[PDB]
Amino acid sequence: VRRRKPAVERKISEIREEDTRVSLIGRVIKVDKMDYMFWLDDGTGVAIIESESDLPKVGQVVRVIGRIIRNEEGIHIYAEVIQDFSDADLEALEEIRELERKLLPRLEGEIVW
Amino acid sequence: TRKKIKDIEAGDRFVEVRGTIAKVYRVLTYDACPECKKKVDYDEGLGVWICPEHGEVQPIKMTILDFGLDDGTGYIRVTLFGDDAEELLGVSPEEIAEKIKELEESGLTTKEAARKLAEDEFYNIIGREIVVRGNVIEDRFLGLILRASSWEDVDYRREIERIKEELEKLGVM
Amino acid sequence: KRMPATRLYIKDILEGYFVKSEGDFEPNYLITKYARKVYRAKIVGTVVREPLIAEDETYGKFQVDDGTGVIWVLGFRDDTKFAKLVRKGDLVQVIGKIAEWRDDKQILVEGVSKVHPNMWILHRYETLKEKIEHIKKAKIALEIYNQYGITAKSKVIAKNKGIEEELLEVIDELYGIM
DNA sequence: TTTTTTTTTTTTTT
Ligand SMILES: [Ca+2]
Ligand SMILES: [Ca+2]
Ligand SMILES: [Ca+2]
Ligand SMILES: [Ca+2]
Ligand SMILES: [Ca+2]
Ligand SMILES: [Zn+2]
């Protein structure tokens, strides 16, 4: 039963070898309309996002959910979902990511039946 | 003043509740007096619209929206009127009146047509997070009904700050 | 009475224990690993696949991913309309009843609507706050249950510590299931 | 400040 693996939230610089589906959030810096690819910069790195149909605009803040593709040319993301994150408070998002990282493992470990 | 639905009582005044639209009971329009906003009666003998308080008046279409709201701690019925209801529904009262007329012509009463239009056309509004402000009246069988004076979109930064305050009380920050 | 919709991670729903009420009018509910009795679920995630509408329009379904898990959301008969509202990629908030089919928990759509990215952030903040609040209360209630069980004395002690009487029953029920 | 008055429940899926 190959159930859909939830998209693992990561930073471009923190992508792991074992990751197969990721959620990245960044700003578009370059769009290639002929090869349907775009360059996403999150502050921690730049990822080449291969899109099938939806191409964002340059300078737009977007959230990408995609599968990681590992080849001889490097690591590119085959985009599945591209959402407009232009009015998103990334400062608040970063703060909640740190809170979950710290508190979630402690909450699970509090179970003493 | 921000109050959780679990803390709401009958007769509550100026309560602010942030929650999710959970159910749509009825969507309908009625002819109202432009001054007192009360239901006007059409006199077939004189061909005019009569308001019990202001007499012969030019009627305006008033929208009524009855729905439910959930905040995670409780559930409350909500009613919006006119411009507030039209703003949330995104449809003009004249267009709603036309749809109610079509349903009534098919053999439905005003009550039946209002429930049907809410389920068939305004079901898209369900699942939306909003902030409602109003007074709580207690219906003898329907329970607590929040008569919302206004509604507005959620200010996410304001809400996040409230949650941070609660986290500080729990010893997180 | 209409019990509240609990804001939860999809993982907490998936790992829970579904309870099918034997009565034809009793609502079904779920008990999470943290002893939380849940009648309705309130989740925020992304629609990952283009909805599935049966040709005969008997059912409509769509998939929601929140980062902690993936769940199916179902609408039957005319309720198929809910699935038609969404599209692949939409960031949405879903409210509905928890259901279990083929030992896989799912959500019977009561409402689904597109949300702003800041709503997803607010959802995560609220979900974590509620989780911490509940765990701390359930930890104290578990100590009361292990010492006294479900007695008239333990119910008085639970009320004094801000714990609902229902919480002790949930712990007992979870112990019976496990 | 308003119209009209009966709350909520299950089960159905290639
Ligand atoms: Ca794409
Ligand atoms: Ca009062
Ligand atoms: Ca108004
Ligand atoms: Ca107003
Ligand atoms: Ca329904
Ligand atoms: Zn008048």
Numbering used by the authors:
A (entry chain C): 5 to 117
B (entry chain A): 186 to 358
C (entry chain B): 3 to 180
Question: What do the paper's sentences say?
Answer:
As the use of homopolymeric ssDNA substrates is more convenient for structural studies, we verified that PabRPA binds to a poly-dT ssDNA, with a similar affinity to random ssDNA (1.25 ± 0.6 nM vs 0.71 ± 0.01 nM). Our data show that binding to ssDNA occurs primarily through the Tri-C. Indeed, while a complete PabRPA complex is required for the optimal binding to ssDNA, the Tri-C binds ssDNA with a dissociation constant in the nanomolar range (Kd=18.8 ± 6.0 nM). To gain insights into the structural basis for the high-affinity interaction between PabRPA and ssDNA, we determined the 3.2 Å crystal structure of the Tri-C bound to poly-dT20 ssDNA. The modeled ssDNA lies in a channel that extends from the Rpa1 to the Rpa2 subunits showing 14 contiguous nucleotides that traverse the OB-2 and OB-3 DNA-binding grooves. Rpa3 does not make any contact with the ssDNA in the structure of PabRPA. While both Rpa1 and Rpa2 subunits individually are capable of binding ssDNA, no interaction was observed for the Rpa3 subunit. Indeed, although the chemical nature of the interactions and the overall ssDNA binding path through RPA are conserved, the DNA-binding grooves of the respective OB domains are substantially different in Archaea and Eukarya. In the PabRPA structure, basic residues of the β3-β4 helical insertion in the OB-2 make contact with the DNA phosphodiester backbone and delineate a crevice that is narrower than in the eukaryotic RPA. The helical insertion also exists in eukaryotes but adopts a different conformation and is devoid of conserved basic residues, suggesting that it may be an evolutionary relic derived from an archaeal ancestor. On the other hand, the contacts between the OB-2 Zn-finger domain and ssDNA are remarkably conserved between Archaea and Eukarya. Indeed, in the vicinity of their Zn-finger domains, the interacting residues and the two neighboring bases superimpose perfectly.
